[PDB]
Coordinates of C-alpha atoms and ligand atoms in Angstrom, one line a residue:
Chain V
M29 CA -19.3 -29.5 13.9
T30 CA -22.6 -27.7 13.3
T31 CA -26.0 -28.7 12.0
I32 CA -26.7 -26.9 8.7
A33 CA -30.0 -26.7 6.8
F34 CA -29.2 -26.3 3.1
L35 CA -32.1 -24.9 1.0
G36 CA -31.4 -25.1 -2.7
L37 CA -29.5 -28.2 -3.9
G38 CA -29.0 -27.4 -7.6
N39 CA -25.7 -27.0 -9.6
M40 CA -24.1 -24.9 -6.9
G41 CA -25.9 -26.0 -3.8
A42 CA -25.3 -29.8 -4.3
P43 CA -21.5 -29.5 -4.6
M44 CA -21.5 -26.9 -1.8
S45 CA -23.5 -29.2 0.5
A46 CA -21.3 -32.2 -0.4
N47 CA -18.2 -30.3 0.9
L48 CA -20.0 -29.5 4.1
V49 CA -20.8 -33.2 4.6
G50 CA -17.2 -34.0 3.8
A51 CA -16.1 -31.6 6.5
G52 CA -18.1 -33.5 9.2
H53 CA -21.3 -31.2 9.3
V54 CA -24.8 -32.7 9.6
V55 CA -26.5 -31.3 6.5
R56 CA -30.3 -31.1 6.4
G57 CA -31.4 -30.4 2.8
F58 CA -34.4 -29.3 1.0
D59 CA -35.1 -28.5 -2.7
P60 CA -38.5 -28.8 -4.4
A61 CA -37.0 -30.4 -7.5
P62 CA -36.7 -34.1 -6.3
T63 CA -33.9 -34.7 -8.9
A64 CA -31.8 -32.2 -7.1
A65 CA -32.7 -33.5 -3.6
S66 CA -31.8 -37.1 -4.6
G67 CA -28.3 -36.0 -6.0
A68 CA -27.5 -34.3 -2.7
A69 CA -28.8 -37.3 -0.5
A70 CA -26.4 -39.6 -2.5
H71 CA -23.5 -37.4 -1.2
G72 CA -24.8 -37.6 2.4
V73 CA -27.3 -34.7 2.8
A74 CA -30.3 -35.8 4.9
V75 CA -33.2 -34.6 2.7
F76 CA -36.5 -33.4 4.3
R77 CA -40.1 -33.2 2.9
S78 CA -40.4 -29.3 3.5
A79 CA -38.1 -26.4 3.9
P80 CA -39.5 -25.8 7.4
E81 CA -38.7 -29.3 8.5
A82 CA -35.1 -28.9 7.3
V83 CA -34.6 -25.8 9.2
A84 CA -36.3 -26.9 12.5
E85 CA -33.1 -28.3 14.1
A86 CA -30.4 -26.2 12.4
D87 CA -27.8 -23.8 13.9
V88 CA -27.2 -22.5 10.4
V89 CA -29.5 -22.1 7.3
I90 CA -27.9 -21.6 3.9
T91 CA -30.0 -20.6 0.9
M92 CA -28.7 -21.0 -2.7
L93 CA -31.7 -20.0 -4.9
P94 CA -32.3 -18.5 -8.3
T95 CA -33.9 -15.1 -7.5
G96 CA -34.7 -12.6 -4.9
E97 CA -38.4 -13.5 -5.2
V98 CA -37.6 -17.2 -4.4
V99 CA -35.3 -16.1 -1.5
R100 CA -38.1 -13.8 -0.1
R101 CA -40.7 -16.5 -0.4
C102 CA -38.4 -19.2 1.2
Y103 CA -37.6 -16.8 4.2
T104 CA -41.3 -16.1 4.7
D105 CA -42.1 -19.9 4.8
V106 CA -39.3 -20.8 7.1
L107 CA -38.1 -18.1 9.5
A108 CA -40.9 -18.9 12.1
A109 CA -39.8 -22.6 12.0
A110 CA -36.2 -21.9 12.9
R111 CA -34.9 -21.8 16.4
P112 CA -34.2 -18.2 17.7
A113 CA -30.8 -16.7 16.8
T114 CA -30.2 -19.2 14.0
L115 CA -27.6 -17.9 11.5
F116 CA -29.0 -17.5 7.9
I117 CA -26.5 -17.1 5.1
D118 CA -27.9 -16.3 1.7
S119 CA -25.4 -17.3 -0.9
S120 CA -27.8 -16.6 -3.9
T121 CA -27.0 -13.7 -6.2
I122 CA -29.9 -11.3 -5.9
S123 CA -30.3 -7.6 -6.1
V124 CA -29.0 -5.3 -3.4
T125 CA -32.6 -4.1 -2.7
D126 CA -33.7 -7.7 -2.3
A127 CA -30.8 -8.6 0.0
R128 CA -31.5 -5.7 2.4
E129 CA -35.2 -6.4 2.5
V130 CA -34.6 -10.1 3.3
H131 CA -31.8 -9.3 5.7
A132 CA -34.2 -7.1 7.6
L133 CA -36.9 -9.7 7.4
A134 CA -34.6 -12.3 9.0
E135 CA -33.5 -10.0 11.8
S136 CA -37.1 -9.0 12.6
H137 CA -37.7 -12.8 13.2
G138 CA -34.8 -13.0 15.7
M139 CA -32.2 -14.5 13.2
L140 CA -28.7 -13.5 12.3
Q141 CA -28.3 -13.0 8.6
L142 CA -25.5 -12.4 6.0
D143 CA -25.4 -12.1 2.2
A144 CA -22.6 -14.2 0.9
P145 CA -22.9 -14.6 -2.8
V146 CA -20.1 -16.4 -4.6
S147 CA -18.0 -16.5 -7.6
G148 CA -16.3 -19.6 -9.2
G149 CA -19.3 -21.5 -10.8
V150 CA -19.9 -25.2 -10.4
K151 CA -16.1 -26.0 -10.7
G152 CA -15.3 -23.7 -7.9
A153 CA -18.2 -25.1 -6.0
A154 CA -17.1 -28.7 -6.3
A155 CA -13.4 -28.0 -5.5
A156 CA -14.3 -25.7 -2.7
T157 CA -12.5 -22.6 -4.2
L158 CA -15.5 -20.3 -4.3
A159 CA -15.0 -16.6 -3.4
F160 CA -17.5 -15.6 -0.8
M161 CA -18.3 -11.8 -0.8
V162 CA -20.0 -11.1 2.5
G163 CA -22.3 -8.3 3.7
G164 CA -23.4 -8.0 7.3
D165 CA -21.9 -7.8 10.9
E166 CA -18.3 -8.6 11.6
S167 CA -19.2 -10.8 14.5
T168 CA -21.8 -12.7 12.5
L169 CA -19.1 -13.5 9.9
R170 CA -16.8 -14.7 12.7
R171 CA -19.5 -17.2 13.8
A172 CA -20.0 -18.2 10.1
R173 CA -16.4 -18.8 9.1
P174 CA -16.0 -22.4 10.1
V175 CA -19.1 -23.2 8.0
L176 CA -17.9 -21.1 5.0
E177 CA -14.3 -22.4 5.1
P178 CA -14.9 -25.9 3.8
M179 CA -16.7 -24.3 0.7
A180 CA -14.2 -21.5 0.0
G181 CA -11.0 -20.4 -1.6
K182 CA -11.6 -17.0 -0.1
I183 CA -14.0 -15.2 2.2
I184 CA -14.0 -11.4 2.0
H185 CA -16.0 -9.1 4.2
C186 CA -17.4 -6.2 2.0
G187 CA -19.4 -4.1 4.5
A188 CA -22.9 -3.9 6.0
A189 CA -25.8 -6.1 4.8
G190 CA -26.1 -5.9 1.0
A191 CA -22.3 -5.1 0.4
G192 CA -21.6 -8.6 -0.8
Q193 CA -24.2 -8.5 -3.5
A194 CA -23.0 -4.9 -4.3
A195 CA -19.3 -5.9 -4.6
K196 CA -20.1 -8.9 -6.8
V197 CA -22.5 -7.0 -9.2
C198 CA -20.0 -4.1 -9.5
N199 CA -17.2 -6.5 -10.4
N200 CA -19.3 -8.5 -12.9
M201 CA -20.5 -5.3 -14.6
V202 CA -16.9 -4.4 -15.1
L203 CA -16.2 -7.9 -16.3
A204 CA -18.9 -7.8 -18.9
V205 CA -17.8 -4.5 -20.3
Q206 CA -14.1 -5.8 -20.5
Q207 CA -15.2 -9.0 -22.2
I208 CA -17.0 -7.1 -25.0
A209 CA -14.1 -4.6 -25.3
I210 CA -11.6 -7.4 -25.6
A211 CA -13.7 -9.0 -28.3
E212 CA -13.9 -5.6 -30.1
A213 CA -10.1 -5.3 -30.0
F214 CA -9.5 -8.8 -31.4
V215 CA -11.9 -8.3 -34.3
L216 CA -10.5 -4.8 -35.1
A217 CA -7.0 -6.4 -35.0
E218 CA -8.1 -9.1 -37.5
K219 CA -9.4 -6.4 -39.9
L220 CA -6.2 -4.4 -39.5
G221 CA -4.1 -7.5 -40.3
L222 CA -2.7 -7.7 -36.8
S223 CA -2.5 -11.4 -35.7
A224 CA -4.5 -12.7 -32.7
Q225 CA -1.3 -14.0 -31.0
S226 CA 0.4 -10.5 -31.5
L227 CA -2.6 -8.6 -30.0
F228 CA -2.7 -11.1 -27.1
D229 CA 1.0 -10.7 -26.5
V230 CA 0.7 -6.8 -26.4
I231 CA -2.4 -6.4 -24.4
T232 CA -1.4 -9.0 -21.8
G233 CA 2.0 -7.3 -21.5
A234 CA 0.4 -3.8 -21.3
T235 CA -2.2 -1.6 -19.6
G236 CA -5.2 -3.4 -21.2
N237 CA -4.6 -6.8 -19.6
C238 CA -7.5 -8.4 -17.7
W239 CA -8.9 -11.8 -17.0
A240 CA -11.2 -11.5 -20.1
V241 CA -8.0 -11.7 -22.2
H242 CA -5.4 -13.6 -20.2
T243 CA -7.7 -16.3 -19.1
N244 CA -10.9 -15.9 -21.2
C245 CA -9.3 -14.9 -24.6
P246 CA -12.2 -14.9 -27.1
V247 CA -10.2 -16.3 -30.1
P248 CA -8.8 -19.7 -30.3
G249 CA -5.1 -20.2 -30.0
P250 CA -3.4 -17.9 -27.5
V251 CA -4.9 -19.4 -24.4
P252 CA -5.7 -23.1 -25.2
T253 CA -7.8 -23.5 -22.0
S254 CA -10.2 -20.7 -22.9
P255 CA -13.8 -21.4 -24.1
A256 CA -13.0 -20.2 -27.6
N257 CA -11.0 -23.5 -28.1
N258 CA -13.9 -25.7 -26.9
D259 CA -16.9 -24.4 -29.0
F260 CA -17.6 -21.7 -26.4
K261 CA -18.9 -24.2 -23.9
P262 CA -19.2 -22.5 -20.4
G263 CA -17.2 -21.5 -18.5
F264 CA -19.5 -18.6 -17.4
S265 CA -22.7 -18.8 -19.5
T266 CA -24.3 -15.9 -21.3
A267 CA -27.4 -16.8 -19.4
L268 CA -25.7 -16.1 -16.0
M269 CA -23.9 -12.9 -17.2
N270 CA -27.2 -11.6 -18.4
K271 CA -28.7 -12.3 -15.0
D272 CA -25.9 -10.4 -13.2
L273 CA -26.2 -7.5 -15.6
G274 CA -30.0 -7.3 -15.0
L275 CA -29.1 -7.1 -11.3
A276 CA -26.5 -4.4 -12.1
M277 CA -29.2 -2.4 -14.0
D278 CA -31.5 -2.9 -11.0
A279 CA -28.8 -1.4 -8.8
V280 CA -28.3 1.4 -11.3
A281 CA -32.0 2.1 -11.4
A282 CA -32.3 2.0 -7.6
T283 CA -29.5 4.5 -7.0
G284 CA -29.9 6.9 -9.9
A285 CA -26.3 6.1 -10.9
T286 CA -25.0 6.7 -14.4
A287 CA -23.2 3.7 -15.9
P288 CA -23.1 4.4 -19.7
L289 CA -20.8 1.5 -20.6
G290 CA -22.3 -1.0 -18.0
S291 CA -25.8 -0.3 -19.4
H292 CA -24.6 -0.6 -23.1
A293 CA -23.0 -3.9 -22.1
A294 CA -26.4 -4.9 -20.4
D295 CA -28.3 -4.3 -23.7
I296 CA -25.7 -6.1 -25.8
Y297 CA -25.8 -9.1 -23.5
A298 CA -29.6 -9.1 -23.3
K299 CA -29.8 -9.3 -27.1
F300 CA -27.2 -12.0 -27.3
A301 CA -28.9 -14.0 -24.4
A302 CA -32.1 -14.4 -26.5
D303 CA -30.3 -16.8 -28.9
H304 CA -27.0 -17.8 -27.3
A305 CA -27.9 -18.2 -23.6
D306 CA -26.1 -21.5 -23.7
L307 CA -22.7 -20.2 -24.9
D308 CA -19.8 -18.8 -22.7
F309 CA -20.2 -15.0 -22.5
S310 CA -16.9 -14.6 -24.4
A311 CA -18.9 -15.8 -27.4
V312 CA -20.3 -12.3 -27.8
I313 CA -17.4 -11.8 -30.2
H314 CA -19.6 -13.5 -32.8
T315 CA -21.9 -10.4 -32.9
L316 CA -19.0 -8.3 -34.0
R317 CA -18.2 -10.5 -37.0
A318 CA -20.0 -10.5 -40.2
Chain U
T26 CA 25.9 5.4 -35.4
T27 CA 24.7 8.8 -36.7
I28 CA 21.0 9.4 -36.1
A29 CA 18.8 12.2 -37.5
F30 CA 16.0 13.0 -35.0
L31 CA 13.1 14.9 -36.6
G32 CA 10.6 16.1 -34.0
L33 CA 12.2 17.3 -30.7
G34 CA 9.0 18.0 -28.8
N35 CA 8.1 16.7 -25.3
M36 CA 8.9 13.1 -26.3
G37 CA 11.5 13.7 -29.0
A38 CA 13.7 15.9 -26.8
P39 CA 14.3 13.3 -24.0
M40 CA 14.5 10.4 -26.3
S41 CA 17.2 12.1 -28.3
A42 CA 19.0 13.0 -25.0
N43 CA 19.2 9.3 -24.1
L44 CA 20.6 8.6 -27.6
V45 CA 23.3 11.2 -27.0
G46 CA 23.8 9.6 -23.6
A47 CA 24.3 6.2 -25.2
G48 CA 27.1 7.5 -27.5
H49 CA 25.3 8.2 -30.8
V50 CA 25.9 11.2 -33.0
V51 CA 22.5 13.0 -33.0
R52 CA 21.4 15.4 -35.7
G53 CA 18.1 17.1 -35.1
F54 CA 15.4 19.3 -36.5
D55 CA 12.3 20.9 -35.0
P56 CA 10.3 23.9 -36.2
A57 CA 10.1 25.3 -32.6
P58 CA 13.3 27.2 -31.6
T59 CA 12.7 26.5 -27.9
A60 CA 12.5 22.8 -28.7
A61 CA 15.6 22.9 -30.9
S62 CA 17.5 24.9 -28.3
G63 CA 16.7 22.6 -25.5
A64 CA 17.8 19.6 -27.7
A65 CA 21.0 21.4 -28.6
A66 CA 21.8 22.0 -25.0
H67 CA 21.9 18.2 -24.4
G68 CA 24.2 17.6 -27.5
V69 CA 22.0 17.4 -30.6
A70 CA 23.5 19.1 -33.6
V71 CA 20.3 21.1 -34.6
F72 CA 19.9 21.9 -38.3
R73 CA 17.7 24.5 -40.0
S74 CA 15.8 22.0 -42.2
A75 CA 15.1 18.4 -42.0
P76 CA 16.8 17.3 -45.4
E77 CA 20.0 18.8 -43.9
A78 CA 19.7 16.8 -40.6
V79 CA 19.1 13.6 -42.6
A80 CA 22.2 14.0 -45.0
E81 CA 24.8 12.2 -42.9
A82 CA 22.5 9.8 -41.0
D83 CA 22.5 6.0 -40.8
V84 CA 19.1 6.1 -38.9
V85 CA 16.3 8.7 -39.2
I86 CA 13.7 8.8 -36.3
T87 CA 10.4 10.8 -36.7
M88 CA 8.4 11.9 -33.7
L89 CA 5.6 14.1 -35.3
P90 CA 2.0 15.0 -34.5
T91 CA 0.1 13.5 -37.5
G92 CA 0.3 11.1 -40.5
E93 CA 0.1 14.0 -42.8
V94 CA 3.2 15.7 -41.2
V95 CA 5.0 12.3 -41.2
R96 CA 4.2 11.7 -44.9
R97 CA 5.4 15.2 -45.8
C98 CA 8.6 14.9 -43.8
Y99 CA 9.3 11.6 -45.7
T100 CA 8.8 13.2 -49.1
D101 CA 10.9 16.3 -48.0
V102 CA 13.9 14.1 -46.8
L103 CA 13.9 10.7 -48.6
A104 CA 16.0 12.1 -51.6
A105 CA 18.6 13.5 -49.2
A106 CA 19.1 10.3 -47.3
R107 CA 21.8 7.8 -48.0
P108 CA 20.8 4.4 -49.5
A109 CA 19.6 1.7 -47.0
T110 CA 19.1 4.3 -44.3
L111 CA 17.0 2.9 -41.5
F112 CA 13.9 5.0 -40.9
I113 CA 11.9 4.6 -37.7
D114 CA 8.6 6.4 -37.2
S115 CA 7.8 6.5 -33.5
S116 CA 4.9 9.0 -34.0
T117 CA 1.4 7.7 -33.2
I118 CA -0.6 7.8 -36.5
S119 CA -3.2 5.7 -38.3
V120 CA -2.3 2.3 -39.6
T121 CA -3.2 3.3 -43.1
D122 CA -0.7 6.3 -42.9
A123 CA 1.9 4.1 -41.3
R124 CA 1.7 1.6 -44.2
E125 CA 1.7 4.3 -46.9
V126 CA 4.8 5.9 -45.4
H127 CA 6.5 2.6 -44.9
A128 CA 5.9 1.7 -48.6
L129 CA 7.1 5.2 -49.6
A130 CA 10.4 4.7 -47.8
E131 CA 11.2 1.2 -49.0
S132 CA 10.6 2.3 -52.6
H133 CA 13.6 4.7 -52.1
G134 CA 15.7 1.8 -51.1
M135 CA 15.2 2.5 -47.4
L136 CA 14.5 0.2 -44.5
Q137 CA 11.5 1.3 -42.4
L138 CA 9.7 0.5 -39.1
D139 CA 6.7 1.8 -37.3
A140 CA 7.6 1.9 -33.6
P141 CA 5.0 4.1 -31.7
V142 CA 5.6 4.2 -27.9
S143 CA 3.8 4.1 -24.6
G144 CA 5.0 5.6 -21.3
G145 CA 4.9 9.3 -22.0
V146 CA 7.3 12.2 -21.2
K147 CA 8.2 10.4 -18.0
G148 CA 8.9 7.2 -19.7
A149 CA 10.8 9.0 -22.4
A150 CA 13.0 10.7 -19.9
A151 CA 13.6 7.6 -17.8
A152 CA 14.3 5.5 -20.9
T153 CA 11.5 3.1 -20.1
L154 CA 9.3 3.5 -23.2
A155 CA 7.5 0.5 -24.7
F156 CA 8.1 0.4 -28.5
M157 CA 5.5 -1.6 -30.4
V158 CA 7.2 -2.3 -33.8
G159 CA 5.8 -3.1 -37.2
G160 CA 8.1 -4.3 -40.1
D161 CA 10.7 -6.9 -41.0
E162 CA 12.4 -8.9 -38.2
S163 CA 15.8 -8.3 -39.8
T164 CA 15.1 -4.5 -39.8
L165 CA 14.1 -4.5 -36.1
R166 CA 17.3 -6.4 -35.3
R167 CA 19.4 -3.8 -37.0
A168 CA 17.3 -1.1 -35.2
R169 CA 17.6 -2.8 -31.7
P170 CA 20.8 -1.0 -30.5
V171 CA 19.2 2.4 -31.3
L172 CA 15.9 1.6 -29.6
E173 CA 17.4 0.0 -26.5
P174 CA 18.8 3.2 -24.9
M175 CA 15.3 4.8 -25.2
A176 CA 13.4 1.7 -24.1
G177 CA 12.0 -0.4 -21.3
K178 CA 10.5 -2.8 -23.9
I179 CA 10.6 -3.6 -27.5
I180 CA 7.8 -5.8 -29.1
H181 CA 7.7 -7.0 -32.6
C182 CA 4.0 -6.8 -33.5
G183 CA 4.1 -8.0 -37.1
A184 CA 4.5 -6.5 -40.5
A185 CA 4.4 -2.7 -41.2
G186 CA 1.5 -1.0 -39.4
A187 CA 1.2 -3.8 -36.8
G188 CA 2.8 -1.5 -34.1
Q189 CA 0.2 1.3 -34.6
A190 CA -2.5 -1.5 -34.7
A191 CA -1.3 -3.0 -31.4
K192 CA -1.0 0.3 -29.5
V193 CA -4.4 1.6 -30.8
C194 CA -6.2 -1.6 -29.9
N195 CA -4.7 -1.7 -26.4
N196 CA -5.5 2.0 -25.9
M197 CA -9.2 1.6 -27.0
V198 CA -9.5 -1.3 -24.4
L199 CA -7.8 0.9 -21.7
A200 CA -10.2 3.8 -22.2
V201 CA -13.2 1.5 -21.9
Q202 CA -11.7 -0.1 -18.7
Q203 CA -11.0 3.4 -17.2
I204 CA -14.6 4.4 -17.7
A205 CA -16.0 1.1 -16.6
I206 CA -14.0 1.3 -13.3
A207 CA -15.2 4.8 -12.7
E208 CA -18.8 3.5 -13.1
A209 CA -18.1 0.7 -10.6
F210 CA -16.7 3.1 -8.0
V211 CA -19.6 5.6 -8.4
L212 CA -22.1 2.8 -8.2
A213 CA -20.5 1.2 -5.1
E214 CA -20.6 4.5 -3.4
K215 CA -24.3 5.0 -4.0
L216 CA -24.9 1.4 -2.8
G217 CA -23.1 2.2 0.5
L218 CA -20.2 0.0 -0.5
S219 CA -16.9 1.7 0.5
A220 CA -14.2 2.6 -2.1
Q221 CA -11.6 0.4 -0.3
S222 CA -13.9 -2.6 -0.1
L223 CA -14.7 -2.5 -3.8
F224 CA -11.0 -1.9 -4.5
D225 CA -10.1 -5.0 -2.4
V226 CA -12.7 -7.2 -4.2
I227 CA -12.1 -6.1 -7.8
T228 CA -8.3 -6.3 -7.5
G229 CA -8.6 -9.9 -6.3
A230 CA -11.3 -10.8 -8.8
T231 CA -11.9 -11.0 -12.6
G232 CA -12.5 -7.3 -13.0
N233 CA -8.9 -6.4 -12.1
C234 CA -6.9 -4.2 -14.5
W235 CA -4.4 -1.4 -14.4
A236 CA -7.1 1.2 -14.5
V237 CA -7.9 0.2 -11.0
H238 CA -4.8 -1.5 -9.5
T239 CA -2.6 1.5 -10.5
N240 CA -4.9 4.3 -11.8
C241 CA -7.7 4.0 -9.2
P242 CA -10.0 7.1 -9.8
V243 CA -11.0 7.5 -6.1
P244 CA -8.4 8.8 -3.6
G245 CA -7.1 6.4 -0.9
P246 CA -6.7 2.8 -2.2
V247 CA -3.7 3.6 -4.4
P248 CA -1.9 6.7 -2.8
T249 CA 0.2 7.4 -5.9
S250 CA -2.8 7.4 -8.3
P251 CA -3.7 10.7 -10.0
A252 CA -7.0 10.9 -8.0
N253 CA -4.9 11.8 -4.9
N254 CA -3.0 14.5 -6.7
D255 CA -5.7 16.6 -8.3
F256 CA -5.9 14.3 -11.4
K257 CA -2.5 15.7 -12.6
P258 CA -1.3 13.5 -15.6
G259 CA -0.3 10.7 -15.6
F260 CA -1.9 10.1 -19.0
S261 CA -3.9 13.2 -20.1
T262 CA -7.4 13.2 -21.4
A263 CA -6.0 15.1 -24.5
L264 CA -3.7 12.2 -25.4
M265 CA -6.3 9.5 -24.7
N266 CA -8.7 11.5 -26.8
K267 CA -6.0 11.5 -29.6
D268 CA -5.5 7.7 -29.6
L269 CA -9.3 7.1 -29.6
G270 CA -9.7 9.3 -32.7
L271 CA -7.1 7.0 -34.3
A272 CA -9.1 4.0 -33.1
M273 CA -12.3 5.5 -34.6
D274 CA -10.4 6.1 -37.9
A275 CA -9.2 2.4 -37.9
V276 CA -12.9 1.4 -37.2
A277 CA -14.2 3.5 -40.0
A278 CA -11.4 2.3 -42.4
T279 CA -12.2 -1.4 -41.8
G280 CA -16.0 -1.3 -41.3
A281 CA -15.4 -2.8 -37.7
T282 CA -18.2 -3.1 -35.2
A283 CA -16.9 -1.5 -31.9
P284 CA -19.8 -0.3 -29.8
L285 CA -18.1 0.1 -26.4
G286 CA -14.8 1.4 -27.9
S287 CA -16.8 4.0 -29.9
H288 CA -18.9 4.9 -26.9
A289 CA -15.7 5.4 -25.0
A290 CA -14.4 7.6 -27.7
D291 CA -17.5 9.8 -27.6
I292 CA -17.3 10.1 -23.9
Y293 CA -13.6 11.2 -23.9
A294 CA -14.0 13.6 -26.9
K295 CA -16.7 15.4 -24.9
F296 CA -14.6 15.3 -21.7
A297 CA -11.6 16.6 -23.6
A298 CA -13.6 19.8 -24.4
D299 CA -13.4 20.7 -20.7
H300 CA -10.7 18.7 -19.0
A301 CA -8.1 17.9 -21.7
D302 CA -5.3 18.7 -19.1
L303 CA -6.5 16.2 -16.5
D304 CA -5.5 12.5 -16.2
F305 CA -8.0 10.4 -18.2
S306 CA -9.2 8.7 -14.9
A307 CA -10.8 12.1 -14.1
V308 CA -13.7 10.8 -16.4
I309 CA -15.3 9.6 -13.1
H310 CA -16.6 13.2 -12.6
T311 CA -18.2 13.7 -16.0
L312 CA -20.6 10.7 -15.9
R313 CA -23.5 12.9 -14.8
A314 CA -23.0 14.9 -18.0
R315 CA -24.1 11.7 -19.7
Ligands
9ON7 C1 -11.3 -19.5 2.2 C2 -10.9 -20.0 3.6 C3 -10.1 -21.4 3.5 C4 -11.2 -22.5 3.1 C5 -10.8 -23.6 1.9 O1 -9.6 -23.6 1.5 O2 -11.7 -24.3 1.5 C6 -10.0 -18.9 4.0 O3 -8.8 -18.9 3.7 O4 -10.6 -17.9 4.5
9ON8 C1 15.1 -4.5 -21.7 C2 15.3 -3.5 -22.8 C3 16.8 -3.3 -23.1 C4 17.0 -1.9 -23.6 C5 17.6 -1.0 -22.5 O1 18.8 -1.0 -22.4 O2 16.7 -0.4 -21.8 C6 14.6 -4.0 -24.1 O3 14.6 -5.3 -24.3 O4 14.1 -3.2 -24.9

C-alpha cells in the first residue's frame, strides 16, 4: 500500500487510477480539466487544486499526459515539490528524445524515473490488461512493480531510460505499415475476383499473418469483432496512430535512420488523419478504393 | 494414376520424385538434360518432347518459369492429351495468364486447376508444399490424391486464378513486412534499444509476424534464421523479386492502388541487382542505398 500522485486523469489516466484505488492505494490526483478530475474523484481519487499539492505527499508520481512538452512542463512545476527519492513513472507516449531529457531532469532533482508507456487503449486500461514497456534501471522497476501490477496484463523491461518509448514506437511503426499493406492486399484481391474470406483464410494460414489481419481485418465479414463491422469505430483511432507515427518520424530524424516504408506509412496516415482522425486506423483501406 | 510432369527443375524434380514414391507412373519432360537425367534416376520415364510425355497421362502437371512458356506448352500438348485429362499448373504466373490457360484447356475438354506453391526446394523435397488452388471444387477433389503426396497443405482459393491471386497477395504483404521489420531493427539499434528487447516486445505485441518470429534479420534472437547463416536462403531475393513483379502486373492490370506493395517491389528489384542469391531478409543491409 503506497501513496500515488496521478497527474493526468483523462481517457487512460482515469481508468488506470481507478484500478489503483481498487487495489488499496491512496491516489492523489490532478488534472487541469475539471471534468476529468471530477470523474476520477467519483471512483475514489482524492483530487487536489494543483499538481504540486498532489505530489507533496507521494511515494510515487505517475504522469499520463498528451505530449512531451506537457510532460516536460509538468516535471518542471512539480519535481521541487516532491519528497527526495520519490519514484516518477511517465506512462505518456512521447518521443525518445523527450523521455531521456525528462528522465535526466527527474534524476537531477533527486528522483527515480522510468518511462512506461502502454498499449491496450481505454479498454485495456479499464480491465487492467495494458502492456507496460519500461525503460530505466532494473532496481527501479522492482520497486515500481507492485504499483504497475494492478494496472497491467504485462510489464516488460526494454532497457535503459527511453527504451520503453523506443520499443513501443518501433512496434507501432511496423503495425501501421502492416495495416496499410493488409488493406492493399484486400483491395487487390477484390479487383482480382479473389473473395475477402478466401484471402483472409490464406494470409492468416501463411507467412503474411499479423494482428492487422487476424484481429483488425479491414473488410467486414471474416472477423466479426473487427472495426470494419462497426463503421470503423475505434478500436485504435487514426488520430492516435498518426501521433505515434509522428513520434516514429521524430525518432527517425533524430537517429539518421532510413525507414522508407515507415515514412511512407507516416505520410499516408498524416493525409488520412486530416479528414478521418475519428475512424479506426484500419479505415485507411478507403483511400485505396475509388 | 499416370502423370505427365512437364518441368523437372529445382521444384519439379523433387515433386515428381515424391509422386513416384507414392506409387504413380510418372512421365516427364524438361529441356535441360541434367534435369531430365536426375528425374530419370528417381524413376520418371523421361521423353524427348512434351506431347509425347502427355500421350498416356491421366494428369498433366506443369512447373514452368513464365505464363508464356505455360501457354505454349498447353498449345503444344493439348491435342496429344486424352479427353478429360486433368491439368494442373503449379507454376507461379500472372492471374491473367492462369485464367487464359485454364480457359484454353477446358475448351479442349480438359479439367484444369491453378495450384502454385509455397515452401521452396526444401518444401518440395520434404513433401510439405502449400498448394493454393483455383478452379472447380469437383476438379480439386479429383486432383487431391495427386497433390497429397507433394503437399503439407491444400487450400481451395476460389475459381480459376484464385490460387495465383492468393499467393501473390500474401507474398506482396510478406515483402512489405520483411522490410518493415528490418527498419524497426535498424531504428531500435540507433535508439540504443537492443535486438533482443525489440524482438521480445514485437513478438508479444501487434507487430508480430513470420518475418520476425522466424526470419529475424539480425543474428541471435532466432538462431536458425538466415541472418545467423550468412543470409543463405531460405527464400531468395531473386524469387521474392519474381513474385513482386507478378504483384506489380496484377496491380497494373486492375488499376489497383498499392503504395507500400509497390514501394517494396522497387526496393527488392534494386536489391536483386546485387544480392539476388541472398535470403530476402538481407534487405536490412540495403536501406542506406535508399
Ligand atoms: C502484469 C502483471 C500482472 C498484473 C495484472 O494482471 O493486472 C505481471 O504479470 O507482470
Ligand atoms: C495434410 C495434407 C495431406 C497430404 C499429405 O499426405 O501430405 C493435405 O491436407 O494436403
